[PDB]
Design a protein around this ligand. Structure first.
Ligand SMILES: Cc1cc2nc3c(=O)[nH]c(=O)nc-3n(C[C@H](O)[C@H](O)[C@H](O)COP(=O)(O)O)c2cc1C
Ligand SMILES: Cc1cc2nc3c(=O)[nH]c(=O)nc-3n(C[C@H](O)[C@H](O)[C@H](O)COP(=O)(O)O)c2cc1C
Lengths: 338, 339
């Protein structure tokens, strides 16, 4: 019982790789091809499922290539695609045969475009593709999730005073910090909504959601004093709202336009809790449901009941206390660029 | 000096070899050369020649019956040498080539291509437009542009998600997105993203009339949809409210290397979303700002809804958007239906 997987990755040393591959693939009864064109890697692997997943696990951690996307996984294949090739390496760059020049140039234009599109896809969708699962045909399921929401404090004022490029530098720097921190703790960013970041966590990731929130506030606090006063990054603040509940996670839309979205009351609650941090001396606020997903011991602070558009309990942690004032900031932002 | 463009498309031998006959004859009288390759129901074509000769030719290929979902991937300008000087139009049937050496390239081309096709469906319409124009969307700078922000969402959606089984909520939301995306695109709008049950789109400042007709068409097609199905279908309960605004917004792609997204930043984006919720409290399913009103040339029968705290802004609508129903009785009827 064998399987076949195909992946692309971003890059004489290659000849050393192919010879080591022929050595190990024979020993592991693995067949397949490695093709490379214009600094790109294309490899097809096939063999028994145990020995293949053992091999692919090594190649994912290889130094020489990165941006490794597994496009297709075949299970229970009937016949080997290349039964005689332990690991045939094909340098498409050196191939000057004029009957393959179109297909070779088409394999580049489509692959270059395919990587550009990958950077816009939702994180969950890319995960589904790496697992050999067709994202269009995955039944949306009801799952218990922690909803994350973070946006820039007083962003309306910042668009008024700053020129366009400084606003874009700022918004990009904010998204970059959020995504890297969220992804590092295991959270899945769903989409950017204006200046708002939306992510989710599994119900066992209550501590990671709180720690992600604290780490984002920390990385922004460092950035503000790490740069000069004229740098617009000196004005970057955030508030974060978390919520727990059941949501429908899946792919909605038409064949024309499709997206990955979460449907549920908790989505709006986390968004409304986030906007509440403008009126609290805490850059973080979450429901009691998030509080009950946390195994670790936090010094939880009760902020009372608040009416969210009946009133729910709102909490925070002692680490997330603001040293500044929300009004002091909107003034010091307006007056800095005044 | 010539231009060269590449595109993929989807199929709708003797019927196809005929395309080679007609095209070879014209490509020489047009001083055009290129290759046409097809594999597992997909079309690939490269072209080159004087710009005027290619622009007029690609316009004919764009409206051809025998293929659909055409996407131009690459476009190079100011080239010296033709990549294929010998062939006015050489067809290649990769489904009928099995030289051993070509098998890896062939299997890789269909896989990468299918995957590419899937990714397009998730791409924002604006990113696809930049790809069609041959412009790398990753290197484009965001700019301040004047837009009409479109906002619409499903009425009483919190009630439906509670009463309906999960698989039935999906059908309703898919159908709603399907109707909105179809109408918004047909009027020259760009769906920018779905936000839960919410649809956000944008129209240029010359499309004020297209923005209103888009909103009335969506209300019309849902009203038609409601009485087209049975009363036990979830679609019998699908209503909508729409809000529009006009203002300067920063349109452009943003994000890190990990995640990129095309988004709109501006005061008007929030102003539009507040109007879509204001329709709950109005006898009209549509509500737009006075800025949208000045983008319309058609003699609309505008209705003034006064100023509204959001400092206050003027709210307008058209008589065609009048709700033939009470909004509050609808939220009651939806509950007492699935109850
Ligand atoms: C593009 C690429 C293709 C590779 N192909 C193979 C392969 O076909 N077979 C294989 O065993 N390893 C392959 N590798 C990875 C190396 O085998 C692996 O990183 C290393 O040789 C581990 O060897 P070791 O067992 O001595 O520790 C590939 C790596 C890259 C970057
Ligand atoms: C996939 C495809 C590729 C085509 N490529 C060319 C082409 O390269 N040159 C050309 O003259 N016609 C090409 N055609 C034909 C045009 O679609 C058009 O129908 C044809 O030029 C009709 O010629 P007419 O203007 O005399 O009616 C192509 C058609 C298809 C379906």
């Amino acid at each position: 019982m064998m399987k076949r997987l195909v992946y692309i990755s971003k890059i004489e040393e290659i000849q050393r790789i192919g010879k080591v591959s022929i050595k190990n693939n024979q020993r592991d009864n693995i067949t397949g091809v490695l093709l490379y064109l214009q600094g790109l890697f294309f490899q097809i692997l096939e063999g028994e499922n145990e020995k293949v997943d053992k091999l692919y696990k090594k190649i994912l951690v290889d130094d020489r290539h990165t941006n490794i996307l597994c496009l297709k996984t075949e299970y229970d294949i009937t016949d080997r695609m290349f039964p005689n090739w332990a690991m045939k390496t094909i340098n498409l760059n050196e191939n000057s045969e004029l009957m393959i020049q179109p297909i070779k140039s088409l394999l580049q234009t489509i692959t270059q475009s395919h990587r550009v599109l990958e950077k816009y896809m939702p994180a969950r969708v890319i995960y589904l593709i790496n697992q050999g699962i067709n994202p269009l045909t995955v039944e949306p399921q009801l799952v218990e999730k922690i909803i994350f929401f973070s946006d820039i404090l007083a962003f309306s004022t910042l668009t008024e005073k700053l020129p366009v490029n400084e606003v874009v530098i700022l918004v990009n720097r904010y998204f970059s910090i959020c995504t890297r921190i969220i992804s590092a703790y295991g959270g899945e960013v769903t989409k950017f909504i204006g200046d708002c970041v939306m992510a989710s966590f599994t119900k066992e990731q209550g501590d990671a959601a709180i720690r992600t929130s604290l780490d984002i506030i920390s990385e922004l606090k460092q950035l503000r004093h790490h740069v000069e006063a004229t740098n617009p990054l000196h004005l970057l603040y955030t508030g974060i709202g978390l919520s727990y509940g059941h949501v429908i996670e899946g792919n909605m839309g038409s064949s024309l336009k499709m997206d990955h979205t979460l449907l549920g009351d908790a989505v709006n609650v986390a968004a409304r809790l986030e906007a509440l941090t403008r009126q609290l001396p805490y850059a973080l606020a979450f429901t009691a449901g998030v509080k009950k997903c946390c195994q670790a011991q936090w010094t939880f602070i009760n902020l009372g009941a608040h009416q969210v558009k009946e009133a729910i309990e709102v909490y925070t942690v002692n680490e997330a206390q603001k040293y500044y004032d929300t009004l002091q900031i909107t003034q010091l932002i307006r007056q800095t660029l005044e």
